[PDB]
Design a protein around this ligand. Structure first.
Ligand SMILES: O=P(O)(O)OC[C@H]1O[C@@H](O)[C@H](O)[C@@H](O)[C@@H]1O
Length: 399
């Protein structure tokens, strides 16, 4: 029965997480213009991305493991300020080692944003709305990623990427203070108030199936998101604007996938779970759309086909992520939640890392088309393996 605190703190969290994701992907968008200005090869960008992904994986694992020695409001503000500062210092730089270092510091700082977001969510809300509130808050990433790719490309006509990065850093710095002044860790303003072992958890042959299902989906999604603009600009003849709009159309369907995965899971169709069929259909759609994008798209093709393929791929790729997040927590052994998700998140992050330097060097050796061929083959093999392996124990922890 509290008022206006829920609104203020929720808006603050939305803004903060939007800025985090916008900074990471603002490097992602300025990559082509940086390549045009600074003559970077095909394997330095992958090196930078891989370094950032590894740093983010380590930071996220550490922050998930240690989530008690914090105030949940100083950590958030410090992370936002550090991200803004590293972006500002990234704006004024030329060489490759500096880029890699200043982006391994950004990836390290990026791990302190999400873990403290739940420490206020669990305390400011009744436990009957946390499930939907998590899903509502998770769309900030899609909102931030569906606006940047087109905005930066359409603004770079008269202003260089340096101005964009500097302004993004300044905005992050200011919103750091604006969010430190508003977020409340726990309700204390006027006065408000409310067997199992690791051996038996790692040995269950379902955690690794879920984990590899996630190292494959996340790696494929990250590789496609990061290199679709380059695949469109080079090889097949399309302008830079069409390539940028592919990413924005990818996140437009991603928002629908995350917010409708839960709706389609429990309803309609209802060991195993009554979501494997939907998950397999989503994976098959992700493979078919990626194959069609690789083959059908040519120099002469209406942009509507490209946008439709991007939206379909986004919908087919952002659904399994939410499905995995739900299923891992639901099938986790009792009193082992959180630590049953840290491993899954760590392997998803390492799969995202695998789509950096190795993908870049595969493309550099032969072509982009071969790299996407390998990605499609991997996805198809994983889908077939999932389809063959359904009746396995999903009650890990004790039997
Ligand atoms: O993928 P990131 O950058 O860790 O974003 C955090 C959230 O991203 C969502 O996509 C996952 O389903 C959540 O479980 C996760 O916490």
């Amino acid at each position: 029965g509290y008022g206006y605190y829920r609104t203020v703190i929720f808006s603050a969290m939305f803004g903060g997480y939007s800025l985090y994701y916008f900074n990471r992907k603002t490097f992602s968008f300025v990559m082509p213009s940086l390549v045009e200005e600074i003559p970077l090869d095909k394997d330095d960008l992958g090196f930078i991305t891989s370094s950032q992904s590894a740093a983010y994986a380590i930071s996220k694992f550490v922050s998930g493991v240690l989530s008690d020695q914090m105030s949940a409001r100083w950590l958030f503000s410090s992370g936002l300020l550090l991200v803004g500062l590293v972006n500002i210092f990234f704006a004024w730089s030329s060489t490759v080692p500096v880029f890699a270092a200043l982006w391994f510091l950004n990836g390290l700082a990026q791990g302190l944003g999400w873990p403290p977001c739940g420490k206020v969510l669990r305390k400011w809300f009744e436990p009957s709305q946390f499930g939907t509130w998590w899903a509502i808050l998770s769309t900030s990433m899609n909102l931030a990623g569906g606006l940047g790719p087109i905005l930066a490309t359409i603004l770079a006509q008269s202003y260089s990427w340096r101005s964009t990065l500097a302004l993004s850093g300044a905005l992050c710095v200011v919103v750091s203070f604006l969010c430190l002044l508003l977020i409340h860790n726990e309700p204390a303003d006027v006065g408000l108030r409310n067997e199992s072992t690791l051996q038996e958890l790692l040995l269950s042959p379902y955690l690794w199936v879920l984990s590899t299902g996630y190292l494959v989906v996340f790696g494929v999604k990250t590789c496609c998101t990061d290199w679709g603009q380059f695949f469109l600009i080079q090889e097949k003849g399309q302008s830079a604007l069409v390539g940028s709009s592919y990413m924005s159309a990818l996140e437009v369907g991603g928002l629908v996938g995350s917010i409708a995965a839960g709706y389609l899971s429990d309803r309609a169709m209802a060991y195993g779970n009554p979501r494997h069929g939907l998950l397999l259909f989503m994976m098959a759609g992700m493979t078919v759309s990626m194959y069609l994008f690789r083959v059908t798209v040519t120099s002469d093709s209406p942009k509507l086909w490209i946008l439709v393929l991007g939206a379909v791929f986004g919908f087919s790729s952002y659904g399994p992520i939410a499905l995995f997040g739900v299923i891992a927590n639901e099938s986790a052994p009792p009193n082992l939640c959180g630590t049953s998700h840290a491993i899954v998140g760590l392997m998803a992050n390492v799969g995202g890392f695998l789509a950096g330097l190795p993908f870049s060097t595969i493309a550099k050796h032969y072509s982009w088309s071969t790299a996407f061929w390998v990605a499609e083959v991997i996805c198809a093999a994983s889908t077939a393996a999932f389809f063959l392996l359904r009746n396995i124990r999903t009650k890990m922890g004790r039997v």
